[PDB]
Design a protein around this ligand. Structure first.
Ligand SMILES: Cc1cn(-c2cc(F)c(C(N)=O)c(N[C@H]3CCOC3)c2)c2c1C(=O)CC(C)(C)C2
Length: 214
């Protein structure tokens, strides 16, 4: 246990992202997939230098899982991951100039790679479970007011990578429907060089398995 407050600029950034993409809320998923792509690409580049870089996990995928009963959305990647330092220690000019003119800013959020906070448009709480190659697995938890970085009591469960858990808003319950998620993945997966899976049910006999989207 250890609680922390966000830096002035980060608090100012969260409000801006929420304003800029208030109507186009579905952009959260594009961002989550963007971070997952950036992480996977980085560990793939590390694998070219370090022979034992992928030992933690041989797979290089994005696994999206819905939980209707507990009202949770999980986006798991087998990317580079994040250390304890990277979780504890984690644009404004070019944004504010474009805001005053009425110009489109959706592309800027993705350009500067600060799109993670778009998850707070749909979630009341965000949980980040991350595992990096030469550090222990940690849990970053935030409701936008405060953030806490704890050591995962389960230990090394991911191998390598990160899971983004979303305690979704009452209004955002629609983003739990498999069909809604499936269509949204296919819309923002075109540029991604890694396979993206969704835990689907065909269906009284029910069959559950990871369905490839890209
Ligand atoms: C900004 C920002 C980006 N990501 C973010 C969030 C992520 F989910 C990822 C990811 N999928 O790995 C990711 N990957 C980069 C690490 C270096 O290479 C890419 C970054 C985070 C932030 C935060 O401010 C809080 C955070 C540390 C919980 C997460």
């Amino acid at each position: 246990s250890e609680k922390f407050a966000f830096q002035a600029e980060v608090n100012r950034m969260m409000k801006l992202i929420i304003n800029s993409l208030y109507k186009n809320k579905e952009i959260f998923l594009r961002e989550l997939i963007s971070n997952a792509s950036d992480a996977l690409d980085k560990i793939r580049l590390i694998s070219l230098t370090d022979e034992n870089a992928l030992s933690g996990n041989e797979e290089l995928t994005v696994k999206i899982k819905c939980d209707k009963e507990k009202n949770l959305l999980h986006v798991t990647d087998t990317g580079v991951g994040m250390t304890r330092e990277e979780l504890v220690k984690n644009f404004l000019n070019k944004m504010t100039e474009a805001q005053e003119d009425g110009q489109s800013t959706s592309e800027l959020i993705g350009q500067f790679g600060v799109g993670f906070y778009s998850a707070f448009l749909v979630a009341d709480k965000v949980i980040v479970t991350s595992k990096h190659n030469n550090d222990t697995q940690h849990i970053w938890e935030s409701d936008s007011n405060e953030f806490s970085v704890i050591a995962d009591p389960r230990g090394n469960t991911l191998g390598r990578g990160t899971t983004i858990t979303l305690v979704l808003k009452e209004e955002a319950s629609d983003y739990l429907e498999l069909d809604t998620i499936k269509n949204l993945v296919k819309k923002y997966s075109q540029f991604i060089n890694f396979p993206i899976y969704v835990w689907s049910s065909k269906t009284e006999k029910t069959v559950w398995d990871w369905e490839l989207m890209n």
